[PDB]
């Protein structure tokens, strides 16, 4: 019957849960004890960007590592400029509710998120000086969670009806619809070769997809509560997630399991954004106990807490040259640590 | 001032842009935002049909109606067939929560299971909202509609199918004031918010005056905390 098929699945679940133990001869803290500690990493608030009047929900650095979009729920999507604090564009949103944003790798488009599950794509480097809506990618039924760009023609919207999509922008349609999640997906991030991308759902599961075919390659279930944030190691062989179980867990992609947990017994509050620094040594994380921790990524210890916000810390991002780490809080200030 | 001739015009733009935010935050903080909860069949689409001034937006439809120089904004959260725990913190800082409960739901059962009556279901939905951690200082308007449908159902069908220990009469005057007092005992927080109930009909027009009478209370109570009195 139904269970007689499901008994094959659980026994096959008992196979892949066995095969990971067949390979974990020694874990990450057993192999990297003969290394130096990175020591204390204190960072100073080099700029601060004070333009909105609401809660900052997401940011995304441009790939020239200077410009910076940040989207707040008073219906404004300001493109900052991190060197000298100048608002390049203030883009008035159609819907006031915005749950993410993303900047293009070319630097031409920004894409607001939404609680009304319409990923609207804006166009900056245009004739006639405006910032106007290029296309609105209706087609989800949930809400929208995190929508990074592959290039100027392919955007991967996560959603709130457990469907990470893959749109085209010239035509308005989807191309694939990566289904297979149970809880709604909460954050995704692309690999540095943009051929795979992870997605962290709301059932303690992180699935590694692929952009071409459209099927899940691996499913990592190590967490306890919902995975709230996700980000890649800078070579596409690992990714570290963030949960509401206050643990950042660093998985990998070729040994299929969890390499390390990053937990301290004084923190209880959730995680909202994880982003590896360049070279993958400083795993940053923004908790919602108002802090912004800086973990070592090869030993489990901490480093300098980048406290300084008067509310939650709701998005991070390291620049693509690894210079600065902008955090976007729930008071209206961004703070570009360095 | 150690800036080039183009960079000096860059921070003229970044202050002209900064003007058109700060002269817009004093246009969105003046107006009143109203979350509109409640079940999708519970007469939620009737209260929006009282006054309306304003297909792809399947998730949230706003309603920008106005009354006596006060732009209101009802956010009908009905299209979200997702988890409330993730997106409800977008709606903190709302001015009031226009809840809604169909009053005829005392004997009508839930559709998926022939148990957990919709009154006991909406009570568990109300309690999770009214005791949420993002909603403490935000008062709850509470509409009870279908009281044109309710009062003829009680004289021909008893109330105590829903409530196990009532021990009362069966008039619309007595019995509905028990449901109204059944709800307002669900908040663990009692003086940090105040439930402004109302027995609205489906055919009158005083309810939009009532929702004006209830946000003029919470704007005052948002100002007493700001002026320093409270």
């Amino acid at each position: 019957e139904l269970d007689q098929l499901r008994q094959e699945a659980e026994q096959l679940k008992n196979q892949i849960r066995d095969a990971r133990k067949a390979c974990a001869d020694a874990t990450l803290s057993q192999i990297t004890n003969n290394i130096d500690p990175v020591g204390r990493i204190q960072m100073r608030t080099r700029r601060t960007l004070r333009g909105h009047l609401a809660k900052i929900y997401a940011m995304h650095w441009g790939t020239d590592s200077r410009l910076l979009v940040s989207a707040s729920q008073d219906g404004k999507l300001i493109i900052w400029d991190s060197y000298t604090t100048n608002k390049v564009h203030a883009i008035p949103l159609r819907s006031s509710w915005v749950m993410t944003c993303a900047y293009a790798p070319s630097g031409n488009y920004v894409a607001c998120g939404g609680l009304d599950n319409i990923c609207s794509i804006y166009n900056l480097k245009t004739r006639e000086g405006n910032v106007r809506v290029s296309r609105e990618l209706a087609g989800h039924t949930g809400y929208l969670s995190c929508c990074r760009f592959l290039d100027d023609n392919q955007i991967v919207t996560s959603s709130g009806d457990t469907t990470c999509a893959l749109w085209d922008i010239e035509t308005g349609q989807q191309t694939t619809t990566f289904t297979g999640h149970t809880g709604d997906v909460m954050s995704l991030s692309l690999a540095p070769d943009t051929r795979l991308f992870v997605s962290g759902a709301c059932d303690a599961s992180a699935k590694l997809w692929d952009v071409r075919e459209g099927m899940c390659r691996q499913t990592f279930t190590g967490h306890e509560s919902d995975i709230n944030a996700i980000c890649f190691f800078p070579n596409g062989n690992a990714f570290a997630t963030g949960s509401d179980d206050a643990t950042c867990r660093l998985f990998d992609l070729r040994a299929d399991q969890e390499l390390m947990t990053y937990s301290h017994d004084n923190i209880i509050c959730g995680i909202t954004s994880v982003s590896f620094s360049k070279s993958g040594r400083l795993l940053l994380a923004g908790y919602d106990d108002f802090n912004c921790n800086v973990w070592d990524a090869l030993k489990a210890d901490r480093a300098g807490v980048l406290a300084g916000h008067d509310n939650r810390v709701s998005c991070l991002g390291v620049t693509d040259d690894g210079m600065a780490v902008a955090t976007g809080s729930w008071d209206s200030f961004l703070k570009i640590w360095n | 001032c150690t800036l080039s001739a183009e960079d000096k015009a860059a921070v003229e733009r970044s202050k002209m842009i900064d003007r058109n935010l700060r002269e817009d935050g004093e246009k969105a903080a003046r107006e009143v935002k109203l979350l509109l909860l409640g079940a999708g069949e519970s007469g939620k689409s009737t209260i929006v049909k009282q006054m309306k001034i304003i297909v792809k937006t399947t998730g949230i439809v706003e309603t920008h109606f106005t009354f006596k120089d006060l732009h209101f904004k009802m956010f009908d959260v009905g299209g979200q067939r997702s988890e409330r725990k993730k997106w409800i913190h977008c709606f903190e800082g709302v001015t009031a929560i226009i809840f809604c409960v169909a009053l005829s739901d005392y004997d009508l059962v839930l559709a998926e299971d022939e148990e957990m009556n919709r009154m006991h279901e909406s009570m568990k939905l109300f309690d999770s909202i009214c005791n949420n951690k993002w909603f403490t200082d935000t008062s709850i308007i509470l509409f009870l509609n279908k009281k044109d449908l309710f009062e003829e159902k009680i004289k021909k069908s008893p109330l105590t199918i829903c409530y196990p220990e009532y021990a009362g009469s069966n008039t619309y005057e007595e019995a509905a004031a028990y449901i109204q007092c059944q709800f307002e005992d669900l908040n663990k927080r009692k003086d940090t918010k105040e439930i402004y109930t109302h027995f609205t009909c489906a055919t009158d027009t005083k309810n939009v005056q009532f929702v004006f009478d209830a946000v003029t209370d919470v704007i005052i109570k948002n100002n007493l905390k700001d002026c320093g009195l409270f």
């Epitope: 410009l67 390049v88 | 001739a5 183009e6 000096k8 015009a9 860059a10």
Partner: single-chain antibody
Framework: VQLVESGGGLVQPGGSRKLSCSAS????????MHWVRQAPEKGLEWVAY????????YYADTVKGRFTISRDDPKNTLFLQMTSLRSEDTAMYYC??????????????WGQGTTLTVSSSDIVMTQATSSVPVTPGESVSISCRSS???????????LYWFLQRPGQSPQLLIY???NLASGVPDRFSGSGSGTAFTLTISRLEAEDVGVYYC?????????FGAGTKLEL
């Protein structure tokens, strides 16, 4: 997008004339407009400017005070009113636009241009080339040396190259340095050195005939150079 404009005719000296630039096609109020003239034998000289929202207005030396400029954001026009003009003010008058942020393209679109005729500290840009007759195919390089060190303390060298095909209105080629404008082919590529510059054309077709103005942008008054004619 267009900036058509009107005015001029033929004014007696010491008089006045309103110059109207009705800029139709874009969102006006984010474009700090300028005004650049071309005397019928000479090159370009900067004349006026007005910033976004009429906040900042600079002026040249030779029309300082006696030329007034104004913007009309709702009616979407642009006004230059000249008071007591001389005989040294007969020129074609261009109505150009420019938007100034990080990575913008200032001086991008140039208006049609109206005549105006009469009746009887600054940086200087030299262009040692003049009237180089060319053939299509040869990689030709156009020099423009400057006087100040145009490289600022933030990486930019504010040198906007240009082009004017004969008869028609001019257009941008190369903004700040070795960047290309929206819609020029990949043949124009520049290279700077701070005080001495070079605009290089890899291959050139017949449509790249005309003059090539180098224009600095380091501080107002922003002075054009006497451009070099290209011919056959």
């Amino acid at each position: 997008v267009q900036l058509v404009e009107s005015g001029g005719g033929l004014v007696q000296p010491g008089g006045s004339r309103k110059l109207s630039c009705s800029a139709s096609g874009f969102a006006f109020s984010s474009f700090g407009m300028h005004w650049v003239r071309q005397a019928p034998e000479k090159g370009l000289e900067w004349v006026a400017y007005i910033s976004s929202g009429s906040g900042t207005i600079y002026y040249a030396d030779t029309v300082k005070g006696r030329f007034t400029i104004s913007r009309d954001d709702p009616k979407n026009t642009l006004f230059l009113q000249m008071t007591s003009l001389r005989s040294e003010d007969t020129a074609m008058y261009y109505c150009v636009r420019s938007i100034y942020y990080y990575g913008s393209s200032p001086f991008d679109f140039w208006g049609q241009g109206t005549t105006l005729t009469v009746s009887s500290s600054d940086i200087v840009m030299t262009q040692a080339t003049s009237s180089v007759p060319v053939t299509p195919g040869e990689s030709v390089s156009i020099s423009c040396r400057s006087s100040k060190s145009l490289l600022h303390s933030n990486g930019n060298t504010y040198l906007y190259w240009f082009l004017q095909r004969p008869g028609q209105s001019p257009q941008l080629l190369i903004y700040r340095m070795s960047n290309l404008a929206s819609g020029v082919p990949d043949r124009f590529s520049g290279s700077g050195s701070g005080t001495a510059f070079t605009l290089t054309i890899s291959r050139l077709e017949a449509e790249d005939v005309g003059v090539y103005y180098c224009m600095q942008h380091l501080e107002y008054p922003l002075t054009f150079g006497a451009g070099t004619k290209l011919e056959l």
